[PDB]
Each structure stands twice: as structure tokens, then as C-alpha cells.
Amino acid sequence: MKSTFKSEYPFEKRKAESERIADRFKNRIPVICEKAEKSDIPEIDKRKYLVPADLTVGQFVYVIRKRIMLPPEKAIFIFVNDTLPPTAALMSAIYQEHKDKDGFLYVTYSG
């Protein structure tokens, strides 16, 4: 049994969120950021992020970093459907290309 975001809320309730957000926030992309299933680094229970269209991967990664007090020495990586996007990539671009049918964009992190 999974302990993810999809597994915690049903499709219909998830999409409900996507829409209210796309409604009450014009320039924001709703992101679900979860820890890589078999990764070792710390797991945060805060996974819902409202990100600006111009936010970059590199910047998003920096955020998750501080959030889980990652030793700058240690590494962390963000994935979008098995794809490791380049740090210059803008989240808006990634959203158009990979948003889930529920309305969210699912990202994953690890080391």
C-alpha cells in the first residue's frame, strides 16, 4: 500500500484542488513534491507547493534543500516522470509538458 499524495486523496478531490487554485491564483503552478520512493535523504510531510511560472528547477531544488537541511556537500535531484530536467528549466514549461491529468505536476527528489 502506497503512502503518496494520490493514494491519500481521490482523483476527483485532487482535480478539485487544481481548479480552485488555477482559479484563485492566476500565475501559480500547483506542485506535488515527494521524496523518491527508495531514496535515503529526509522526508518532509509538506508536499504541496504553489510555484511561480518563472521559478526555475535550480531554484526549486535549492528550496527543498534548505527545507530538509541538506548538507551543501550532499546531492539532491529532481525528477519529472523519470526525467532529470536541467536546472535552468522553468516550472511553467515543465507543467505544460508534464502536468498530470488531475491538474498537478508531480516532481520527485533524491540523492
Binding site: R28, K46, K48, Y49, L50, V51, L55, Q59
Partner: peptide, 4 residues
Amino acid sequence: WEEL
């Protein structure tokens, strides 16, 4: 939610 967290606004980044």
C-alpha cells in the same frame, strides 16, 4: 500550501 507553501508559496515559493
